[PDB]
Motif scaffolding. Sequence first.
Motif, PDB file in Angstrom:
ATOM      1  N   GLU A   1      50.352  17.464  17.852  1.00 35.83           N
ATOM      2  CA  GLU A   1      50.414  18.242  16.596  1.00 35.83           C
ATOM      3  C   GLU A   1      49.786  19.481  16.689  1.00 35.83           C
ATOM      4  O   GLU A   1      48.609  19.457  17.449  1.00 35.83           O
ATOM      5  CB  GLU A   1      49.567  17.441  15.431  1.00 35.83           C
TER       6      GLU A   1
ATOM      7  N   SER B   1      53.532  21.509   9.517  1.00 29.60           N
ATOM      8  CA  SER B   1      53.041  20.749  10.562  1.00 29.60           C
ATOM      9  C   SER B   1      53.823  21.611  11.616  1.00 29.60           C
ATOM     10  O   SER B   1      54.773  22.211  11.513  1.00 29.60           O
ATOM     11  CB  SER B   1      53.499  19.321  10.385  1.00 29.60           C
TER      12      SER B   1
ATOM     13  N   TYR C   1      51.458  12.232  10.096  1.00 31.67           N
ATOM     14  CA  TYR C   1      51.669  12.126  11.618  1.00 31.67           C
ATOM     15  C   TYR C   1      51.293  10.864  12.135  1.00 31.67           C
ATOM     16  O   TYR C   1      50.304  10.096  11.760  1.00 31.67           O
ATOM     17  CB  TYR C   1      50.656  13.210  12.221  1.00 31.67           C
TER      18      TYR C   1
ATOM     19  N   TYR D   1      56.329  11.181  13.290  1.00 26.12           N
ATOM     20  CA  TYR D   1      56.004  10.985  11.921  1.00 26.12           C
ATOM     21  C   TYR D   1      56.401   9.591  11.484  1.00 26.12           C
ATOM     22  O   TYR D   1      57.128   8.670  12.102  1.00 26.12           O
ATOM     23  CB  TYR D   1      56.865  12.181  11.328  1.00 26.12           C
TER      24      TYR D   1
END
Lengths: 57, 57, 418, 418
Positions: D240, D299, D219, D148
Amino acid sequence: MLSVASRSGPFAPVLSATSRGVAGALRPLVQAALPATSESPVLDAKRSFLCRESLSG
Amino acid sequence: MLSVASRSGPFAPVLSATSRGVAGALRPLVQAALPATSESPVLDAKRSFLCRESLSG
Amino acid sequence: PQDLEFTRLPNGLVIASLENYAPASRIGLFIKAGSRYEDSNNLGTSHLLRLASSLTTKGASSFKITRGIEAVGGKLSVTSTRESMAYTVECLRDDIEILMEFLLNVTAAPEFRRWEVAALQSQLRIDKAVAFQNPQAQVLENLHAAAYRNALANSLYCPDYRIGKVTPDQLHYYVQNHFTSARMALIGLGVSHPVLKQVAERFLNMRGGLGLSGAKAKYRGGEIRDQNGDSLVHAALVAESAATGSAEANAFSVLQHVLGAGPHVKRGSNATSSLYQAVAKGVHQPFDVSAFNASYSDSGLFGIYTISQAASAGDVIKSAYDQVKAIAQGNLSNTDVQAAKNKLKAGYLMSVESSEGFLDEVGSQALVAGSYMQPSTVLQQIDSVADADVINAAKKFVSGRKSMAASGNLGHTPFVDE
Amino acid sequence: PQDLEFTRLPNGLVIASLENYAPASRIGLFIKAGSRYEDSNNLGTSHLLRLASSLTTKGASSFKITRGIEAVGGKLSVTSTRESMAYTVECLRDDIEILMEFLLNVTAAPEFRRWEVAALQSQLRIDKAVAFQNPQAQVLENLHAAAYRNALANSLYCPDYRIGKVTPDQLHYYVQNHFTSARMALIGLGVSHPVLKQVAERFLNMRGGLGLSGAKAKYRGGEIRDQNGDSLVHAALVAESAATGSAEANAFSVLQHVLGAGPHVKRGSNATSSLYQAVAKGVHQPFDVSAFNASYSDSGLFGIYTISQAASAGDVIKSAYDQVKAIAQGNLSNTDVQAAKNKLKAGYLMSVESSEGFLDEVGSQALVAGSYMQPSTVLQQIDSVADADVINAAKKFVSGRKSMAASGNLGHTPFVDE
């Protein structure tokens, strides 16, 4: 053939027998402390301040 | 809605008043020492494993 | 006069001497060693080898080396880079044959006793903490690790987990494999040519040949961020360029002086730096920008370097990067290429002026190319760079894959993909 | 019986109680705080807030809290994750109204005096070094920073430069902005429903709404390597996936148990793990493989985790990654999807079995969804996952951009692009 130091920017360290450890060619480059304050080292492992520029004779 | 601990793998730390600091759910994950030679090394500072949480009375 | 005598021995050794008639002499030994020749099982061996020049050898104890050199007022020093190590001795002209025997004992017959190597391990921690009081030391070690996968990602200083664990057998293995005669150059500055040769057959008895076959460096386009409590943000952004000793390397040197590579006037406002003027259009806080260049035997890096305040770090990097794009699509005046050639020529003649700068310049020529060239041959190569070659080097930067490293309060610094 | 009483107060507070007739009670307060709500100027404030539960408050000194809780044999603990903080009190059934007044003083009226906060700073260094004796703790903090750019990149433990510098005004600002009534759930396990409500209007007087607007997590597909002296290589490789509480999140949970998520037999050879059998075909050294899953409110990450010896680390990672590709192009038997549903259902009913696991399960449902669902509604959602949904989740992993983190002797570990 031309050196690391000839084009400016890659690093070099030095060790002596009777002199002080040094680093780099242009690392601390000028017109950095011209403005603001780049206040300098608060020392805890004190190496020198002027680098052996005395005893000129 | 399902927790961090429900799907396995994200971390959690815990802190006490009378018990020991802990970390994670599936960190000491099994069949790691069960194929051999995982020595567990000694401390200069740490917590007690039992956590006291499990004694019959 | 007497420009230089230059000789290759039948097993690789290069010997070069100049006879001044100056009262002091300087003698250097240059070796193809350094941190690019260690693998992941022996990191930090070259840092400890640099610190060990006054330990016991086979011909002199550690007491005799320190007392014998100080009795005549001499010096001994070691300089290293990622690709080279240099051992230097200097004294007055009558004493130089005493200090030559000490220099051949430090490099050709070291002992590495257990109790001396164990007492030296704590010096590694002191030397690294002194160097890291400059914020550019850690940024430039992180930049090389982000840019390469191996060979050119190894640091100049020993890693922290490894301090205390460099063994005497690792030191014996490094010297035996990398300090051989076909990788060495012996350079003298106030001595004669036949006296250096008889010195050379004193370590021509062993250590013949090339060594081992380091690997090619493989480029990796990566990023390393380092959040800390420093008051200013340092950042660097580079791409792969060109190896030392090619026609594209001269074009990258000219492009560095077009953009700006350090000031000429004390407290001056840098009126002929392209990068500095473009950043100062919209940023009215203290800053500093420069172009960065680093050339090696098989690869090179070129880019920009900024120092700014934390809330202005993205503004400074975008303004600087937008100036290189303007050059890459043709905007490059002819009077700007000429003023950049003057700064590059004058800086080269000023750096060979003293005895320390001249000895370094000759020693790096003998390791990489195996010859000596006068500064009038060098000055012709700079004048043969065309204006289209400078524009082509700025297009290789703009289209190439980037690497980045930053440190400070990184909450407003862009990521390398943004 | 009496399954659960569930109530939303007119300003957001959620209250939920179950009346067992057990001799012990447990009361928890669950808050939407945690390390994802701090920015780059106040990192590590949530770690120090976790350690400060027995300092002086406005209704009890630090002496009265420690002595009053220990007099009846009670406990007090704090559990945190990247998105949540939980304050838990337990004692015997006759003493629970004494320990409820202490819990509302720790969370609704703290003082942060200078001399107490300054003596607590050294505890941050002890707590972090104890947790980092497990090599998974540092790999999993480096994996979130590689994956991240902001929010979920922040670690659970305070950074080293920041120890000594968390100020009392930073603690006062964090509690005032993140500990408010519309972000809180009060959950009781051996108490009555009207007695928790009267407790609730003694901190309904202040901290009345939502807090501040943390940012969405962006991301980043990155890499963090960490060379050290550990004897084994740990490595993780993710992509992800999907947020908590969607139909794709259930498909990733089934896929985790198809590949293998930990053993069932003491010293067993893991006969029904797909990942473990594929690696063991060509690797005959000690190792361990697992599938990794981590779901959050906006997420998620899914991938693999290996532990191996240094000379075998590339062999293990390639064999494991080649098994997920076989699933993504259709090779998935029907008796394998059914055995994975049995392990997922049985593991969910065993984790809600004790009082600590049940209280955690109810408290995370009230923060994210604002309701309670029986385990028979949960077990229906698992049986409605189709075989084509599992194959589609393995194609999202294979085609997605990767993140990586590794530690140990990394001289044979592949880079994320190789």
